[model samples]
Target chain A: TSDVVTVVLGQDAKLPCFYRDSGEQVGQVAWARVAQELALLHSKYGLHVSPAYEGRVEQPPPPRNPLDGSVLLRNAVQADEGEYECRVSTFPAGSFQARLRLRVLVPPLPSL
Target chain B: TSDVVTVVLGQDAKLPCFYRGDEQVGQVAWARVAQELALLHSKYGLHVSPAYEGRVEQPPPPRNPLDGSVLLRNAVQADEGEYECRVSTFPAGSFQARLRLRVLVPPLPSL
Candidate 1:
């Protein structure tokens, strides 16, 4: 599915994603900022976040439904705006994905 | 400055704004760019338009004192358009910004 998310210049932004879970085993969940390569990775082994986004990007815990692959970006900036993709790997069923755009808004400077 | 933002169907969108002033910010308001209606208004908390009730909200307190940003939840095609954000300071009166919001619907895959 295609999606877009808009956030303020320096606020936490959420890229919503909740792939259909048909009781399949989830192998991994990956997130990428199309232009910046991988942003985060979550698997049974462990978790990995890109160096540039190490402290800023992370997936919200999915306690209720493990299929939720949404990622939260802290302190979003103008340079961080772009399209992002989320892919979920499922056992015996292969993988599926969702793409979204992140739009960052910098309000006009104060003027008389 | 003019700005453009996009969101997907049924997703939330943030329409950002802020006014740099020496005085304390008082009230904040938002409206459709060309429409003669207010989408949201703030003074005693919030008073959003019926069409946007339970759908629009200020980011949160403990927020940037100058931030006049609003989050639009569950966006639909009808919500696509330019939005005007205005804030009233103690004495600077009001300052405003206009931002356009675009909605995109992804096409389903096929064989």
Candidate 2:
């Protein structure tokens, strides 16, 4: 929850979330930049990425197990730098959530 | 090179690149760093990797061809890896930039 993933101003970012596998099925994995505005949703209903992040954000392919709910952000910009929340909902085990920050850096110019 | 570029399965990918100066570009090359697979190369003659044969190209003019940026269409999970873009300019030698590409699987169809 306190983890910070840093990226260059025009680079991509990964906001991670996870839940215990243990035979439980993951019902959904939702992401948001704010409390009410949903950024992405991956669930039994399929995937729905918000208009703002339609093409630049995606859920990584998973075979590693342990319910990876991480979302990758492409070409991260200044506006993309913020705290992201990842919510994992699983059967029988209820729901789990975490928040992480995406820090963007502006590289320094080279001297003459 | 700070973060990995993400793309959903079957979608196109835009890998960006930027270089210094306005010197005439002599050539440009795009390759997968890990396996050293050449995705695109332009010098005396243009060449594209068989794996990416008809699905790779640059952004074209007005967008700055010297940027060395490329558009990879219909990306597959096998395309997930590190990429390098090298630009060769007259009298300035050459320079390169590296980036990572991550391919994501699409969600299952809803019932």
TM-score, per-candidate, Cα-based: 0.56, 0.49
Can you tell me the DockQ of model 1?
0.07
Q: For candidate 2, what is the DockQ? A: 0.05
Check candidate 2 and list the clashing pairs: none
B1-111 in candidate 2: lDDT tens per residue?
Answer: 234576655657888876667466666777888443443334453567786677877676565545667789988888877888777767878777888887666333221
User: Highest TM-score: which candidate?
Assistant: 1
Q: Write the per-residue lDDT of candidate 1 for residues A1-112, one digit (tens) a residue.
A: 3386766677688877776735686667788876666654555565677887768876675563566767778987888877788888877776888888877766543331
Candidate 1 lDDT over residue span B3-60, tens digit each = 7776666768888887765476666778897443333333455667776778877776
DockQ of each: 0.07, 0.05
lDDT of 1: 0.71
